[PDB]
Amino acid sequence: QSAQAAHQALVEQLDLHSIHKTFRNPNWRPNQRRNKTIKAILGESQTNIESAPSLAPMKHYCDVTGLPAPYLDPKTRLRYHNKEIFAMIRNLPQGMGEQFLEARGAHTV
Amino acid sequence: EPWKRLPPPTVYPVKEARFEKYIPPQLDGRERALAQPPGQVAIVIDNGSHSVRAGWNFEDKPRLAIPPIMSKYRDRKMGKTFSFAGSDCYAARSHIRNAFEAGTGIVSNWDVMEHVLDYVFVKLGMNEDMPIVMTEAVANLPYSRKSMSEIIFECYGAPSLVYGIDSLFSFRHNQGQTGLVVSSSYSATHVIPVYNRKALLSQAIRLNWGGWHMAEYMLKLLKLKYYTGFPGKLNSSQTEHMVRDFCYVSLDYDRELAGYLDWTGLEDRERIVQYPYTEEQRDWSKSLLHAFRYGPRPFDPSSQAETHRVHLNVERIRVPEVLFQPAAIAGVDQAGLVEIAGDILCQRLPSLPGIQDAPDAFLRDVFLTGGNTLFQNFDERLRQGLMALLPVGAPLRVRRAQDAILDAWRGAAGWACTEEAKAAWITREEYLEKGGEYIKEHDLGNA
Ligand SMILES: Nc1ncnc2c1ncn2[C@@H]1O[C@H](COP(=O)(O)OP(=O)(O)OP(=O)(O)O)[C@@H](O)[C@H]1O
Ligand SMILES: [Mg+2]
Numbered sequence: 001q002s003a004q005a006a007h008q009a010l011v012e013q014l015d016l017h018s019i020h021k022t023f024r025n026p027n028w029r030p031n032q033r034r035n036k037t038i039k040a041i042l043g044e045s046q047t048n049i050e051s052a053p054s055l056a057p058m059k060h061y062c063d064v065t066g067l068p069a070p071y072l073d074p075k076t077r078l079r080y081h082n083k084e085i086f087a088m089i090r091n092l093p094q095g096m097g098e099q100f101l102e103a104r105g106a107h108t109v
Numbered sequence: 110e111p112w113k114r115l116p117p118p119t120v121y122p123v124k125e126a127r128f129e130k131y132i133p134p135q136l137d138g139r140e141r142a143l144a145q146p147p148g149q150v151a152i153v154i155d156n157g158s159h160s161v162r163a164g165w166n167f168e169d170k171p172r173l174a175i176p177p178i179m180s181k182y183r184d185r186k187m188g189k190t191f192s193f194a195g196s197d198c199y200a201a202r203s204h205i206r207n208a209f210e211a212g213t214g215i216v217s218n219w220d221v222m223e224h225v226l227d228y229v230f231v232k233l234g235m236n237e238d239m240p241i242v243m244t245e246a247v248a249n250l251p252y253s254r255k256s257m258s259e260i261i262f263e264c265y266g267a268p269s270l271v272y273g274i275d276s277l278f279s280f281r282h283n284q285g286q287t288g289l290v291v292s293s294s295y296s297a298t299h300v301i302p303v304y305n306r307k308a309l310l311s312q313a314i315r316l317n318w319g320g321w322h323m324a325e326y327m328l329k330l331l332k333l334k335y336y337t338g339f340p341g342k343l344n345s346s347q348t349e350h351m352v353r354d355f356c357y358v359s360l361d362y363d364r365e366l367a368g369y370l371d372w373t374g375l376e377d378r379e380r381i382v383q384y385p386y387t388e389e390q391r392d393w394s395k396s397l398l399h400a401f402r403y404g405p406r407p408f409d410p411s412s413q414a415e416t417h418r419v420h421l422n423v424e425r426i427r428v429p430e431v432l433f434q435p436a437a438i439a440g441v442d443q444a445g446l447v448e449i450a451g452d453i454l455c456q457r458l459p460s461l462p463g464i465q466d467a468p469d470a471f472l473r474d475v476f477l478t479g480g481n482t483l484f485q486n487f488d489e490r491l492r493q494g495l496m497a498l499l500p501v502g503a504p505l506r507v508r509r510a511q512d513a514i515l516d517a518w519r520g521a522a523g524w525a526c527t528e529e530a531k532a533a534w535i536t537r538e539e540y541l542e543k544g545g546e547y548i549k550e551h552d553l554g555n556a
Contacts, residue, residue: 016228023266038213052449054443068366084396102329
């Protein structure tokens, strides 16, 4: 079908692999281990010291809706706005509470 | 009942990163480069984690803007390898890899990066030698600079290279003499004090929140809101366009938030994006979660048109506010943007003994850069936050860059061939002497 043939023609027109990069040095070949992670690059040091913690009091927001939360559930550890959302929170499926914590990046796994 | 009286909803089709058209090699660019005076040409690469922007120093805008992605695979139905390294890679099989470590400003997949540079030079029309100006991250890691230097010198044979900071090129392009540069970008957010055109990078701070984190966080929120199971495929490429189109910074978060889901007026605090569906006395009207999920109107799962749409509501404002309230809203456990800028202006710069007229000289130009500042009210929110911390009547001004995305490239292009820049260039022979960790320290670059 012409539409598929046109798609192949476009895919060929977009392809870089068919093109010889005259400006490349053919002799140079990288160390394949060069793709280190930042964790590894830092750990090899033994300036990304620009991070900044905080000490101001933290306002409390509802884990379900993001509205302000007066209440913290001692069971699920979710913060909730009102008793309707408390009804939801304790009716959550088996793994869903951990997902709401993960949006805060809290975890108990 | 009010929902009978409300109009039909207005709904926006879901946008996503997509291929639009092929662009050929721009041979007129190579021609113009050979026509310029000697020593007044460079290839300028704003190596942004959201877009690589590339062009000629003698031109007013980049010729290329592409994601730092490659797709390479063998078509089992044709027996040949295909490779793609920009928006030719459709972000149709999406074997995508990205040059950057996700949520950081640092290049780490050098194979993708080298393919991206191949695409850049091909589409700039190089076929066989030109000075290269390239932006790097603030405090870019030495190992990362080495690897990029090796590629530029040893693979591509370029005569000269220099590394600057996109934030600082943007400041100088906007006549920045002295000020506090606030950059919020795809990878990160930075506050850098600049004194007499030189950045005091020992006093700069990084937030670790930016436009990538907002798209990811918006995705988490939507997957939670519809945890019963949204039938569309939710991608952070879509939520990026939602954050761009619909989110804005609150001028008064708690007072705007607490009323946001109020049934009156929610009709247009909500905004509705539709995914492409395949066409075939206490109740919902008093519930909060219906308003949160479905707004002022009745819902039925029978309508394929009313499924396959998400209602944004609180995340219209909740997403941008992570910059200001990082631990509260997303557990980022870092000082908010106003607290960071306040700490620099109030504590550091008055203490730093070499400086004169601190903070006041800096207050006269707090400067906003990078795409993730483009939220509405971002300036006024930042101004009012700082105004409470600064002494009464301090001459605080907050100013936006012109064209806050491309303007960082324009700064590098205008700087590229100045004598200050050419004093900062490293030649290949200097690289062969010193290796790629060495740099000429200069006003716009790392130490
Ligand atoms: N009008 C807009 N309003 C809000 N956000 C926007 C707007 N336009 C672009 N963005 C977002 O801002 C970011 C673009 O930032 P920018 O292009 O300045 O960074 P970069 O140079 O690619 O990255 P970095 O310096 O962090 O490596 C993206 O996350 C994009 O979705
Ligand atoms: Mg950038």
